[PDB]
Amino acid sequence: RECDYCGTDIEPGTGTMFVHKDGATTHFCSSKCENNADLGREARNLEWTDTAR
Amino acid sequence: PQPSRPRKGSLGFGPRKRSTSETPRFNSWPSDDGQPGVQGFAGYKAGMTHVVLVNDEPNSPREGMEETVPVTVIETPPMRAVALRAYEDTPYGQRPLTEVWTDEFHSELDRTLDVPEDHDPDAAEEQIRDAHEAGDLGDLRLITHTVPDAVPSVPKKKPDVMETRVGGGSVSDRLDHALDIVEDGGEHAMNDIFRAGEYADVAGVTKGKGTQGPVKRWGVQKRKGKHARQGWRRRIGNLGPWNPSRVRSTVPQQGQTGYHQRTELNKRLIDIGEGDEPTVDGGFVNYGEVDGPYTLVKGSVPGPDKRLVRFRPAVRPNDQPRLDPEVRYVSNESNQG
Amino acid sequence: MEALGADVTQGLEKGSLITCADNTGARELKVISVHGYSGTKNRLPKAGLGDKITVSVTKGTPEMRRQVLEAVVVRQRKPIRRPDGTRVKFEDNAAVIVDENEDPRGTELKGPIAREVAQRFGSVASAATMIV
RNA sequence: GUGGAAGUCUGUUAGAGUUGGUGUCCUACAAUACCCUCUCGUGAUCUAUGUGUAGGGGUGAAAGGCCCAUCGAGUCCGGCA
RNA sequence: GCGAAAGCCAAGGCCUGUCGGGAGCAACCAACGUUAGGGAAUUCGGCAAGUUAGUCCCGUACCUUCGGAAGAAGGGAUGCC
RNA sequence: GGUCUUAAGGUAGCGUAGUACCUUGCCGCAUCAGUAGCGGCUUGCAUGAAUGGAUUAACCAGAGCUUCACUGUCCCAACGUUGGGCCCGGUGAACUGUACAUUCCAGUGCGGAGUCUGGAGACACCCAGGGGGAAGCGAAGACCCUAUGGA
RNA sequence: CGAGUGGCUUGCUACCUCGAUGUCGGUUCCCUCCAUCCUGCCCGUGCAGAAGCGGGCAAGGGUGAGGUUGUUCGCCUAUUAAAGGAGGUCGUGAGCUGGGUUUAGACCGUCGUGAGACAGGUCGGCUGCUAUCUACUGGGUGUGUAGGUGUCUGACAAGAACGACCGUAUAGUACGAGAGGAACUACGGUUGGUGGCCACUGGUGUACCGGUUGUUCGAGAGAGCACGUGCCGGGUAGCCACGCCACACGGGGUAAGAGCUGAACGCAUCUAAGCUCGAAACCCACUUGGAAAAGAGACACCGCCGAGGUCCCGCGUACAAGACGCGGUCGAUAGACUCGGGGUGUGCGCGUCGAGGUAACGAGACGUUAAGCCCACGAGCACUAACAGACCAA
Ligand SMILES: [Cl-]
Ligand SMILES: [Cl-]
Ligand SMILES: [K+]
Ligand SMILES: [Mg+2]
Ligand SMILES: [Mg+2]
Ligand SMILES: [Mg+2]
Ligand SMILES: [Mg+2]
Ligand SMILES: [Mg+2]
Ligand SMILES: [Mg+2]
Ligand SMILES: [Mg+2]
Ligand SMILES: [Mg+2]
Ligand SMILES: [Mg+2]
Ligand SMILES: [Mg+2]
Ligand SMILES: [Mg+2]
Ligand SMILES: [Mg+2]
Ligand SMILES: [Mg+2]
Ligand SMILES: [Mg+2]
Ligand SMILES: [Mg+2]
Ligand SMILES: [Mg+2]
Ligand SMILES: [Mg+2]
Ligand SMILES: [Mg+2]
Ligand SMILES: [Mg+2]
Ligand SMILES: [Mg+2]
Ligand SMILES: [Mg+2]
Ligand SMILES: [Mg+2]
Ligand SMILES: [Mg+2]
Ligand SMILES: [Mg+2]
Ligand SMILES: [Mg+2]
Ligand code: NA
Ligand code: NA
Ligand code: NA
Ligand code: NA
Ligand code: NA
Ligand code: NA
Ligand code: NA
Ligand code: NA
Ligand code: NA
Ligand code: NA
Ligand code: NA
Ligand code: NA
Ligand code: NA
Ligand code: NA
Ligand code: NA
Ligand code: NA
Ligand code: NA
Ligand code: NA
Ligand SMILES: [Sr+2]
Ligand SMILES: [Sr+2]
Ligand SMILES: [Sr+2]
Ligand SMILES: [Sr+2]
Ligand SMILES: [Sr+2]
Ligand SMILES: [Sr+2]
Ligand SMILES: [Sr+2]
Ligand SMILES: [Sr+2]
Ligand SMILES: [Sr+2]
Ligand SMILES: [Sr+2]
Ligand SMILES: [Sr+2]
Ligand SMILES: [Sr+2]
Ligand SMILES: [Sr+2]
Ligand SMILES: [Sr+2]
Ligand SMILES: [Sr+2]
Ligand SMILES: [Sr+2]
Ligand SMILES: [Sr+2]
Ligand SMILES: [Sr+2]
Ligand SMILES: [Sr+2]
Ligand SMILES: [Sr+2]
Ligand SMILES: [Sr+2]
Ligand SMILES: [Sr+2]
Ligand SMILES: [Sr+2]
Ligand SMILES: [Sr+2]
Ligand SMILES: [Sr+2]
Ligand SMILES: [Sr+2]
Ligand SMILES: [Sr+2]
Ligand SMILES: [Sr+2]
Ligand SMILES: [Sr+2]
Ligand SMILES: [Sr+2]
Ligand SMILES: [Sr+2]
Ligand SMILES: [Sr+2]
Ligand SMILES: [Sr+2]
Ligand SMILES: [Sr+2]
Ligand SMILES: [Sr+2]
Ligand SMILES: [Sr+2]
Ligand SMILES: [Sr+2]
Ligand SMILES: [Sr+2]
């Protein structure tokens, strides 16, 4: 599985899945990603992200 | 109305003092059943990682499915069963009678013992077999030691020495079995004793925390609300009633916490191998890299990384064995991060 | 009860106010008790995903308000752990009013439900639109 | 719109005070202190110096408050051993 | 900056709100920072802590001695170039 | 009762009150549940008109109650910061002390004993600790009574 | 109606204490009692079942959260297997609280000519001490047993180390007309308690990296101060719980109870002798301590001119002093350096762009740049430092 945020692969037996209000689903590999997302930042605008890269 | 409430902490692990031997000492051994065999082994704790296993439990709704399981990596290189001690039965319990030693000793066993230069293995054996003839022979055990040198992550070279009982068929047969091991050179491994999937009891001296107060040491409450601002935050209400006019040893007080021997029952052995498959990227934090004989124990094990841990076939297993669990993945992701 | 199939860290207590994810007419629910639970001195009774709880209606239609009813927790903000290690958390805390037989009193569920819950209360599941 | 009243409002301006913490202290820094919070701050305001009222007497927006760490009758010495 | 406010800095003064050395420096205490989910369940009592906050625009109830209530409430804005 | 003491016999109002013993009065509101609070009732143990009654905008570090918001008050505690604490150099008190004193369990005794009796336990010394006991230390009990005491 | 036990209520007495033994309630923390609320095992029933009701053994464990009220008590609510009662100076203020009671201020009702009074109501109203002894929790130094190392024994000691519940199969079965509706046993899970651990999730992280406000160092760069981070965002190690792991079966002897054989008393009789069974309770099993167990222990090897040990040195798996553990060139013990593994988020400088503006100037954007900065971790590596060396010892 890939992180629906930064793009990197999610180490099996790890990460969290956030279930949005409408039922959507976002798989995060770490708190760092969740926390940037919570700040309203978009992964493509963050240079360190695979997505961005 | 003064609601009930269990007491704070167990009264069965005391006194809560510093352990006398850092090397754990079992106070019980498995029962005698199968062919003779050493009833224990030892290794050094390295760290933890996780693995993904195929569910074994034939009574589980998830049988045959992926399951992530925490694992503690223990380096378990070969040990040397260096001697055979015999115990005789006496009106005052079991007492050491004699020992049968060898000739080949690891190059550094002399960092702990005064290795034998002149010994007579036959007079000793004779005395032992005579004791068996007389019927005054108590259990049989092997003087065993580890080879720290084979473990780079562990600084020590001074071997750790422990006695491990030999159980098995008939005494005559295991007595012979014991002598065999010893005489060789004593070299034996984790395989010779355990098989992946079996349950072992692990013993170790817990991580030390020096002096700690009742809240941390015994799990008593902290003062609450307004009671926490008057000058007392982490002190118990009182040391006892007016009478008896003395403080009972049962009231939670400050003192040594940690560095106590503990025997953790029924730890499932997930995998016994050798190499660097379980090792972690960057190296296990505060330990080093694993590349050699190792054992993956399910869950946690007492003690800090590098401490000597001891294994023994579980003496009170709750479940039946499900040998060689299928490991589909062993995490090697860095433990820093 | 039947094994849930996941590890839960109760994210609610007696008195917590939560969303009523159905069309019964109740908008907000207050937790009064947790079925089968028995705690310890000074411990506030806690409830989480999969628990059946007694509730009182705090917000909703006049007819529903103040009624004391049974419900099932279907979503919570505090994470839960699935057999594969992944944690799962929702956008809010929600429950569905249920009757003596555990059948949803309402006719439609609102928002997603946890697969673990659906499996324990099938009739509640056979009313869900999304099951995460 | 002008005007700029007020025992008027906000305000750690100066300055005055002291609701709560029943915090700190409680052989104290201190025989009444420390910190935060809090109240007043153009007036029956606050403040310095000078000056007057004296003990069954003063003074008192009155609490038996105050009259030099003491007041339901000051202090000193005497009556007095 | 509204400011004799805060904060920072000059002129000027000081290192004397006058015992030092050492241990990643433990328990415990005094001040204090950060705490997931729940959110007053705590307690005699929201005690303690927190929340809100400056300025501009919109807008503002009951009641009223018509002065007031009122910054009621509630909503929006706020930098740099 | 349908007057009598002792002059009159409680009017407007308010009322279970900072006054109501009974009392958590009864009805209602609000809460999952409210000896609270508010509204109503009211025969008021024992309200009531300058011993002022009623009422009331504004004001209040005044008493009680509810709600929104918020939060480590709590569930249930954790980690961290500064100063102490701990070890070292120097400086260097006080409180307290009939004696003896390593105590514990029972009993006894002026009936609430480290010291008496019977048992049990107990090798000496030292460090840190939180304070069970010494009916701990501090103050010739402010309560109560007594005194042919004081004010 | 009669006979008792307790010392939880109240009263009585005035034996102890007035050169003082600080009230109630609550809180915190520990031990106990049984007249048992639940849980285990039983007996009876107006016992079909399910369930009630009554009784017996039994104190291992549990007995919880909330609303009024200072309340104890009690009333009330939803949960629960059940939400038992009582003793410990009505346990617990040299532990906390200070709401009630019970000083000085004040009000009301009633009483009193009045001062004033009233287990009537009401608002406000102070909680000192550096532990000498003893007690206990932990940590040391000595002596005794009587050269050293390593391994043990186990007298004794502690434990609740485990208690309870839900669900599934049994089974819509037995039972019952039906309604309703079990059990043995085997399983899965939850809860309370317990011990440990950090791969996972979460918290912290005044290491670190970044953003940014005011001000000062002329600007820039780079910095100080704004309380022990100015504020905000992220977060490594470590520590933690909200995270994760582990916490019996089986024996032995009994109680109540069910019986066998069995006589006194030819019969009968579970009892008098004997015996078979039978509780969460008792003992063992399991965990933890434990040679100072004065009968002061056992074994093996080493050594008495030398085994072993101390000082010293580099360090932590340890740690308040002390103690403990490891390494010391026969070496990777610590540091430097370089890789690896991590944190942050794209450096300075320069070049292009940039709303505009004659120009000067210009917030900011892109590129260089997965950049720059940083690391309590790992590996490699004797480069530096574990050197030199002093001493005890049958
Ligand atoms: Cl407390
Ligand atoms: Cl509840
Ligand atoms: K007295
Ligand atoms: Mg990590
Ligand atoms: Mg990670
Ligand atoms: Mg409580
Ligand atoms: Mg003057
Ligand atoms: Mg929090
Ligand atoms: Mg409460
Ligand atoms: Mg406050
Ligand atoms: Mg009323
Ligand atoms: Mg009149
Ligand atoms: Mg006197
Ligand atoms: Mg008096
Ligand atoms: Mg007089
Ligand atoms: Mg008397
Ligand atoms: Mg006293
Ligand atoms: Mg009984
Ligand atoms: Mg029945
Ligand atoms: Mg008991
Ligand atoms: Mg008492
Ligand atoms: Mg006391
Ligand atoms: Mg006191
Ligand atoms: Mg004190
Ligand atoms: Mg009061
Ligand atoms: Mg007066
Ligand atoms: Mg009185
Ligand atoms: Mg009062
Ligand atoms: Na204090
Ligand atoms: Na006391
Ligand atoms: Na005008
Ligand atoms: Na004050
Ligand atoms: Na006078
Ligand atoms: Na000086
Ligand atoms: Na009157
Ligand atoms: Na005023
Ligand atoms: Na806090
Ligand atoms: Na004491
Ligand atoms: Na009696
Ligand atoms: Na019991
Ligand atoms: Na109550
Ligand atoms: Na007392
Ligand atoms: Na008390
Ligand atoms: Na006190
Ligand atoms: Na008290
Ligand atoms: Na038995
Ligand atoms: Sr009590
Ligand atoms: Sr051993
Ligand atoms: Sr043992
Ligand atoms: Sr206090
Ligand atoms: Sr006593
Ligand atoms: Sr004014
Ligand atoms: Sr006060
Ligand atoms: Sr404060
Ligand atoms: Sr004072
Ligand atoms: Sr003002
Ligand atoms: Sr002015
Ligand atoms: Sr005076
Ligand atoms: Sr005189
Ligand atoms: Sr200057
Ligand atoms: Sr000086
Ligand atoms: Sr932070
Ligand atoms: Sr409250
Ligand atoms: Sr409450
Ligand atoms: Sr606003
Ligand atoms: Sr009238
Ligand atoms: Sr009036
Ligand atoms: Sr004696
Ligand atoms: Sr102390
Ligand atoms: Sr006395
Ligand atoms: Sr009994
Ligand atoms: Sr029962
Ligand atoms: Sr009482
Ligand atoms: Sr009552
Ligand atoms: Sr009262
Ligand atoms: Sr009174
Ligand atoms: Sr009071
Ligand atoms: Sr002697
Ligand atoms: Sr069933
Ligand atoms: Sr049916
Ligand atoms: Sr600073
Ligand atoms: Sr701010
Ligand atoms: Sr019997
Ligand atoms: Sr000995």
Side-chain angles (χ1 to χ4, degrees):
Chain A
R1 254 180 180 302
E2 253 174 43
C3 179
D4 293 314
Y5 190 75
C6 74
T8 71
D9 299 313
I10 294 185
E11 163 75 309
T14 292
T16 307
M17 178 201 286
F18 175 72
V19 185
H20 296 269
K21 183 179 171 191
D22 64 356
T25 284
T26 302
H27 292 77
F28 290 103
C29 75
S30 56
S31 54
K32 182 181 177 175
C33 285
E34 288 170 277
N35 291 313
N36 282 70
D38 280 1
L39 294 171
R41 290 163 166 171
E42 295 177 308
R44 316 201 80 166
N45 305 298
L46 294 185
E47 282 182 290
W48 58 267
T49 287
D50 278 352
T51 304
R53 290 172 183 169
Chain B
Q2 290 292 330
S4 286
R5 169 212 50 155
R7 50 162 292 119
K8 308 298 186 166
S10 174
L11 253 16
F13 296 81
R16 254 73 164 182
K17 53 174 287 182
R18 292 177 190 173
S19 185
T20 288
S21 296
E22 191 168 302
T23 282
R25 310 291 178 175
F26 284 113
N27 85 136
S28 266
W29 299 102
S31 74
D32 296 294
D33 299 311
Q35 305 175 287
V38 199
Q39 301 181 301
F41 198 75
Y44 296 89
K45 182 174 175 174
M48 294 188 77
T49 70
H50 61 285
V51 56
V52 179
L53 270 46
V54 171
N55 187 292
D56 274 292
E57 198 170 67
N59 298 301
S60 169
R62 293 185 53 66
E63 184 174 6
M65 304 199 271
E66 304 296 67
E67 206 161 63
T68 300
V69 179
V71 145
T72 303
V73 178
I74 300 177
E75 293 209 70
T76 46
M79 298 199 286
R80 306 296 183 76
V82 92
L84 176 276
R85 169 176 281 175
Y87 288 76
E88 73 161 317
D89 285 327
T90 78
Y92 317 93
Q94 307 192 311
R95 296 194 172 177
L97 198 169
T98 33
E99 293 154 45
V100 180
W101 283 67
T102 58
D103 320 294
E104 292 190 61
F105 304 100
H106 179 268
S107 62
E108 284 162 305
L109 183 48
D110 56 298
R111 275 171 181 267
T112 335
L113 330 166
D114 282 315
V115 188
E117 293 185 61
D118 291 301
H119 178 55
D120 178 32
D122 318 82
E125 186 183 315
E126 190 193 309
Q127 196 170 70
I128 291 183
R129 323 198 80 113
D130 286 334
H132 179 23
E133 283 176 49
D136 306 312
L137 191 64
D139 65 312
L140 299 175
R141 311 185 205 171
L142 297 177
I143 302 297
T144 292
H145 84 263
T146 60
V147 188
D149 241 49
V151 186
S153 296
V154 181
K156 70 205 291 191
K157 298 162 191 170
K158 171 182 173 72
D160 290 306
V161 186
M162 59 269 263
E163 192 174 301
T164 305
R165 177 167 186 280
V166 179
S170 62
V171 296
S172 296
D173 280 295
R174 68 164 155 286
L175 194 182
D176 290 306
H177 180 62
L179 285 171
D180 294 305
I181 304 176
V182 181
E183 309 302 54
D184 307 299
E187 187 167 355
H188 54 311
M190 182 85 298
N191 306 303
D192 307 326
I193 304 164
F194 303 90
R195 158 125 78 143
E198 298 179 310
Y199 287 107
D201 292 336
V202 188
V205 171
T206 62
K207 305 178 65 178
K209 293 163 193 306
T211 71
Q212 298 297 321
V215 172
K216 178 169 179 59
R217 192 190 205 218
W218 294 98
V220 295
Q221 307 193 332
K222 305 199 315 177
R223 300 235 171 165
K224 298 303 176 182
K226 185 174 295 178
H227 301 306
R229 296 179 247 126
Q230 313 305 310
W232 295 261
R233 293 179 176 287
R234 309 177 117 276
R235 300 181 184 182
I236 66 170
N238 65 269
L239 304 176
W242 195 308
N243 281 302
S245 305
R246 62 200 170 71
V247 178
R248 268 194 258 249
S249 57
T250 53
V251 333
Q253 303 196 63
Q254 154 258 60
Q256 246 294 314
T257 86
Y259 204 69
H260 306 129
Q261 173 172 301
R262 289 283 184 278
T263 294
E264 202 124 334
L265 283 31
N266 306 327
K267 295 303 206 190
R268 194 192 192 192
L269 299 175
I270 299 301
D271 177 40
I272 307 175
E274 162 171 33
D276 71 353
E277 289 147 282
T279 205
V280 162
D281 285 325
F284 281 92
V285 183
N286 283 299
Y287 184 69
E289 308 173 324
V290 166
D291 194 345
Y294 71 75
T295 301
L296 297 179
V297 169
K298 187 194 176 188
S300 49
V301 158
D305 306 308
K306 299 192 187 181
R307 210 191 280 324
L308 182 79
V309 293
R310 284 233 273 165
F311 306 89
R312 148 237 274 184
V315 302
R316 50 180 292 183
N318 287 313
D319 309 301
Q320 206 58 57
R322 285 118 53 205
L323 319 176
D324 300 80
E326 184 175 310
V327 172
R328 287 190 184 162
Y329 181 63
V330 180
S331 184
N332 295 301
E333 185 184 57
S334 177
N335 277 1
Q336 299 172 64
Chain C
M1 295 198 266
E2 179 186 54
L4 223 205
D7 267 298
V8 186
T9 296
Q10 292 83 157
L12 310 174
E13 327 190 319
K14 185 180 182 74
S16 299
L17 293 175
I18 62 184
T19 292
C20 185
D22 63 34
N23 67 324
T24 53
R27 293 188 166 180
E28 180 176 75
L29 307 176
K30 172 197 293 169
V31 183
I32 295 175
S33 296
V34 180
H35 188 80
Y37 186 79
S38 177
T40 188
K41 187 190 174 182
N42 297 328
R43 176 171 298 176
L44 321 191
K46 58 188 181 194
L49 263 190
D51 283 313
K52 180 158 61 177
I53 57 174
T54 288
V55 175
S56 94
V57 180
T58 286
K59 289 179 177 174
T61 59
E63 303 272 299
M64 283 302 271
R65 272 183 297 168
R66 284 186 52 66
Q67 276 189 60
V68 177
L69 310 167
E70 273 178 46
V72 169
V73 187
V74 174
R75 309 198 292 269
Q76 70 171 44
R77 293 190 172 107
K78 188 66 178 176
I80 67 173
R81 187 171 59 78
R82 287 182 165 170
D84 87 306
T86 313
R87 304 297 179 179
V88 184
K89 61 185 183 181
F90 301 80
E91 183 270 324
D92 74 329
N93 304 301
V96 170
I97 293 177
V98 107
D99 70 43
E100 230 205 325
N101 310 303
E102 309 192 309
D103 289 305
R105 183 196 169 93
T107 261
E108 309 182 307
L109 299 195
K110 305 179 181 183
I113 291 194
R115 65 162 80 143
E116 289 79 21
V117 184
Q119 176 219 48
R120 170 176 291 174
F121 304 98
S123 61
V124 168
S126 71
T129 290
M130 296 145 276
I131 295 180
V132 185

